[PDB]
Design a protein around this ligand. Structure first.
Ligand SMILES: CNS(=O)(=O)Nc1nccc(Cc2c(C)c3ccc(Oc4ncccn4)cc3oc2=O)c1F
Ligand SMILES: [Zn+2]
Ligand SMILES: [Zn+2]
Lengths: 410, 224, 293, 220
């Protein structure tokens, strides 16, 4: 008897024999999990040392093992925005998997080149700023609903009397960050620095995505669960075309109104953050720990952020978006989440995802949550694969059916 | 004749020029001779993308009608019918090809299973598109004797049986709306394949596995 | 012999309290103090807010009433909690010494002669929690040890609700971590964790220096790297007795196999040595806090 | 009716069959009426796919045509069947362009795109055409780009999308066809730096990365 775990911690005692490899023996319990014995990894420990599939059970008797995951290729020629996924170029013609939605060029696995695509002061003064009421809290501040010729918001924060050279950069942070005019972003009326420092925004009805996915739990279907992956990646491409890292991507900050209009706020602020306890940029871990990458939890760099650490903060608002629960919702701890997320021992379990989730996404949401940073895709592609299968949903609105043959020749 | 007509599809598949290899595989099987496995699946490969694309289109075309006056609503109606006429004719081409030449000359068991498997599948596309009860019933029969002959010859992990079981399950739910019959046979074919999944042919090793995970995706979707 | 009673209180609602001042600024929750007109007695107002499902919130408040039967002179008594203002109001006893977080920040250091007395109270206050209620503290930190100028020291803020253990575990950020390696490595061995969480907490009292950056600040994650990768810290000698090192080093070993059971922690001579010598605690704080009687 | 024409394409716009709408955009302006923006956008997208479908079909079969001889000879007549459609499909627009589109340009952005559209459609013919007609077709796009490219500078913004689209198409014409990479890489940088100096936005930036992506390749 050689006990082995499974994804979702499930248990199965496979038989112990001699001369026949783990592959087909484990495949039985594996295949009810839908795991081919060519794509997964199993571990033997003398932390977690992987072992393959050609191992006879003679040396494996009486040992506990884990089961952890580590293609039929038709051809196609892509008639809209299609970005390769092995060198992340622009794809016009090339392969595509039938079920997993992952396209790539055979070249990258006298030749041609590329071409065109298939087209389609000024600070809020004190006095008139009507300071609001008790509204709540968050990671670094508080909302105050203002009343001055319309609906606005006021914030507070944690640096009281900064050095004069700090404040002039604050006039430049807004100049970089007041230019965010978009449809996914609420307007920025300015800020009030004569009173305690603020970051003035608008106010929106409805609520955020965290309220919609942890309190009311009015879970939607993919016609809306992929629209939200659209009207939130788009608001995080304009935010990165001009290099303003959100660095605050929370399901609690995605304030959508009427369930049609999607709005995003509460971002930026590298001067209020990076506290000037002296005259440095020493940033601090204030807030939650789920929307944070391994290297933002680690803080092992002076500035460990990136546009990638805004993508590991997009999978967590996506792995929340499908299942309906929240990531790491079973560990009855605080410092255990921080240790593993920072270390690389544990990552969110993808077994708890829905049964009707499109397999084309399994190569998207897994990238937006990879342990490393040099792998997760940048935000223009996120709006690409989510426009792609936002309208390919009526094509795949049925149950399954028998697919085509290989059509792949090497 | 056949040798050139095999290549003319092996050159129109690679360039996604389907309607050429839809109208050239029809011309290599109306030769009146038997089909080896090579040109066998290409005949299915050819039509599946040809007949599927308008179904893949009519699904998209009709959905916009489900996404909606008297002028805008009308405009999809004529166009969706224009898909229907194109889809109806392509369905009948193989059905006429199946009944007149293919099925009578089906010498081998799994081949006899295969061409019958197409027949129900093809009426299924007319079933989803569309008296109307004759289409759904004849698919049920064509599946029915397809499944019945499947139980005898081939090893119980064959893609054709599971593909039929996967196919025949979908007809139960999406037209008749009887998932419990669909769930059981999908479960039965899936579960039975578990025990019989001994050492398996490398050729069908990849193809059978791809089917089985889809069956669970049907089951795991059908559990709710 | 201590005569603790909480039957004087009646219905509790926000309009029946008038605030006085704030006890101090805590880490996870901020502690207040308020005046209740019917009861009259001063109370400790611990306001922690959780925007959670009301059913989950309601499942916890009803479980906060089990604090009534966990009564002792070793654990702070529970006046009563209720839901209002959108916030959870965990009222507690108002003890004039706050906790021993202010004490270290005011007195600068705490001598060995005091640690002997407090280690007696907690090791039995924890025993009152385990052997009676079958649950343990899970939150052994110095700022959860309420003290007063009456010569008494007591514990507070244990795990009263397994739901709010996790519902707040993603809201209790903090910056200092005394959690045991067994509670961080990925499994739970609760029987031995609270000993470490007390072993490290006392070193914060004996020396007053946070030992995770070794004596002989680090990033919030970097502390746990020390906690669960390399051998544990140890108390300085000289100013501390060598037989006191026989106590702390038995409470600060990673592997629970080498950890001594609670029963082993009363069979030791030093734990039975601390109570052999008496210490005044009425004039001790009054000579360093400015309070009287 | 103009409403019916624009709608009918939009029902097939996402249906993945692109010949059908390409066969109805011809009827849109065979009357010769004035073109607004969106319909003019729908006119462009059609034949790029239809040619692209043919070009992508052209590309692959050429590899078989370049693979090798009893089997390989089947490709050539099959290959020549593709362009015979492809040449006919493209020449429909060039006939449409030189009858109702180009001589009816009105605004600053009207003239620039059609000429680049005319040049690229000539380039698509220039991809395959051989013999004395090869350079004759290639030449007729040299001015087609040149006519528009000099209008782009004086009439529309450095970041207005058409110029980057034109510059990228104008630049790529020099390397693959003209065998003139030096005139290309030194030319992309001019348009590359023009927009970034004085840097409705997504279309702009994707051409920008393509400009840098092509500049890197052109330097390989
Ligand atoms: C930090 N470690 S953890 O174990 O992971 N998490 C937690 N551990 C303990 C506790 C908590 C949360 C928590 C708090 C804040 C609390 C506060 C006052 C209280 O009332 C009271 N009354 C009388 C005597 C003692 N308390 C009971 C309480 O119960 C709780 O569960 C963790 F969130
Ligand atoms: Zn590539
Ligand atoms: Zn795949």
């Amino acid at each position: 008897i050689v006990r082995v775990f499974l994804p979702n911690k499930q248990r199965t005692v496979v038989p112990a024999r001699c001369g026949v490899t783990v592959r087909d023996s484990l495949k039985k319990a594996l295949m009810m999990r839908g795991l081919i014995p060519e794509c997964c990894a199993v571990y033997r420990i003398q932390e977690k040392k992987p072992i393959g599939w050609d191992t006879d059970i003679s040396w494996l008797t009486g040992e506990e093992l884990h089961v952890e995951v580590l293609h039929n290729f038709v051809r196609k020629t892509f008639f809209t925005l299609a970005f390769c996924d092995f060198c992340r170029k622009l794809l016009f013609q090339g392969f595509r998997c039938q079920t997993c939605g992952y396209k790539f060029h055979q070249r990258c696995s006298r030749d041609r080149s590329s071409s065109a695509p298939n087209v389609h002061d000024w600070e809020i003064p004190d006095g008139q700023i009507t300071v609001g009421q008790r509204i709540g809290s968050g990671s670094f501040g508080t909302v105050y609903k203002g009343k001055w010729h319309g609906d606005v918001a006021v914030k507070m924060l944690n640096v009281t009397a900064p050095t004069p050279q700090q404040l002039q950069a604050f006039k430049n942070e807004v100049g970089v960050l007041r230019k965010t005019r978009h449809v996914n972003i609420l307007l920025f009326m300015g800020y009030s620095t004569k009173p305690q420092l603020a970051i003035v925004t608008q106010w929106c009805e409805g609520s955020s995505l965290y309220h919609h996915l942890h309190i009311i739990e009015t879970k939607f279907e993919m016609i809306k669960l992929i629209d939200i992956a659209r009207q939130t990646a788009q608001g995080m491409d304009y935010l990165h075309a001009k290099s303003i890292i959100h660095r605050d991507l929370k399901s609690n900050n995605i304030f959508l109104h009427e369930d049609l209009t999607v709005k995003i706020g509460d971002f930026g602020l590298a001067t209020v953050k990076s506290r000037w306890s002296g005259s440095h940029q020493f940033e601090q871990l204030s807030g939650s720990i789920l929307w944070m990458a391994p290297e933002v939890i680690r803080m092992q760099d002076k500035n460990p952020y990136s546009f990638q650490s805004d993508v590991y903060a997009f999978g967590i608002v996506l792995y929340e978006l499908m299942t309906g629960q929240l990531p790491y919702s079973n560990i009855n701890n605080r410092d255990q989440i921080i240790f593993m997320v920072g270390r690389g021992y544990l990552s969110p379990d993808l077994s708890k995802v829905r049964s009707n989730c499109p397999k084309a996404m399994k190569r998207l949401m897994a990238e937006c949550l990879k342990k490393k940073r040099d792998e997760r895709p940048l935000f223009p592609q996120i709006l690409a694969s989510i426009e792609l299968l936002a309208r390919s949903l009526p094509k795949i609105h049925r149950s399954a059916s028998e697919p085509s043959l290989n059509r792949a020749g090497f | 004749d056949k040798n050139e007509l095999v290549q003319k599809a092996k050159l129109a598949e690679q360039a996604e020029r389907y309607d050429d290899m839809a109208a050239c595989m029809k011309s290599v099987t109306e030769q009146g001779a038997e089909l080896s496995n090579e040109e066998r699946n290409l005949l299915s490969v050819a039509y599946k993308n040809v007949v599927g694309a308008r179904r893949s289109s009519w699904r998209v075309v009709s959905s916009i009608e489900q996404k909606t006056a008297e002028k805008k609503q009308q405009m999809a109606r004529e166009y969706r019918e224009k898909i229907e006429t194109e889809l109806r004719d392509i369905c009948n081409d193989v059905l006429s090809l199946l009944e007149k030449f293919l099925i009578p000359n089906a010498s081998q068991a799994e081949s006899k299973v295969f061409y019958l498997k197409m027949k129900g599948d093809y009426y299924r596309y007319l079933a989803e598109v569309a008296d109307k009860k004759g289409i759904v019933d004849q698919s049920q029969q064509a599946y029915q004797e397809a499944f019945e002959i499947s139980k005898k010859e081939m090893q119980p992990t064959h893609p054709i049986r599971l593909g039929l079981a996967l196919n025949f399950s979908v007809f139960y739910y999406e037209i008749l709306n009887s998932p419990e019959k669909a769930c059981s046979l999908a479960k039965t074919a899936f579960d039975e394949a578990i025990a019989e999944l001994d050492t398996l042919s490398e050729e069908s090793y990849k193809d059978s596995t791809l089917i089985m995970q889809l069956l669970r995706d049907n089951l795991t979707l059908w559990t709710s | 012999a201590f005569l603790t009673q909480k039957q004087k209180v009646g219905e509790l609602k926000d309009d029946d309290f008038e605030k006085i001042s704030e006890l101090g600024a805590g880490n996870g929750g901020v502690v207040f103090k308020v005046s209740h007109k019917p009861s009259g007695l001063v109370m400790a107002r611990k306001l922690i807010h959780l925007e959670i499902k009301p059913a989950i919130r309601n499942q916890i408040i009803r479980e906060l009433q089990v604090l009534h039967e966990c009564n002792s002179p070793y654990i702070v008594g529970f006046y009563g909690a209720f839901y209002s203002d959108g916030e959870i109001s965990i009222c507690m006893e108002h003890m004039d010494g706050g906790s021993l977080d202010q004490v270290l920040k005011k007195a600068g250091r705490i001598p060995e002669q005091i640690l002997g007395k407090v280690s007696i109270a907690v090791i039995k206050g924890l025993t009152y929690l385990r052997e009676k209620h079958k649950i343990m503290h899970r939150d052994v930190k110095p700022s959860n040890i309420l003290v007063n100028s009456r010569g008494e020291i007591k514990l507070c803020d244990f795990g009263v609700s397994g739901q709010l253990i996790d519902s707040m575990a993603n809201s209790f950020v903090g910056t200092r971590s005394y959690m045991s390696p067994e509670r961080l490595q990925g499994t739970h061995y609760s029987v031995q964790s609270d000993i470490w969480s007390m072993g490290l907490s006392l070193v914060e009292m004996a020396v007053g220096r946070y030992p995770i950056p070794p004596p002989d600040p680090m990033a919030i994650f970097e502390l746990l790297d020390y906690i669960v990768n390399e051998p544990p810290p140890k108390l300085p000698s000289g100013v501390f007795s060598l037989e006191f090192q026989d106590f702390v080093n038995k409470c600060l070993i990673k592997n629970p196999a080498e950890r001594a059971d609670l029963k082993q922690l009363m069979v030791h001579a030093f734990i039975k040595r601390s109570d052999a010598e008496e210490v005044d605690f009425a004039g001790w704080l009054c000579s360093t806090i400015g309070l009287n009687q």
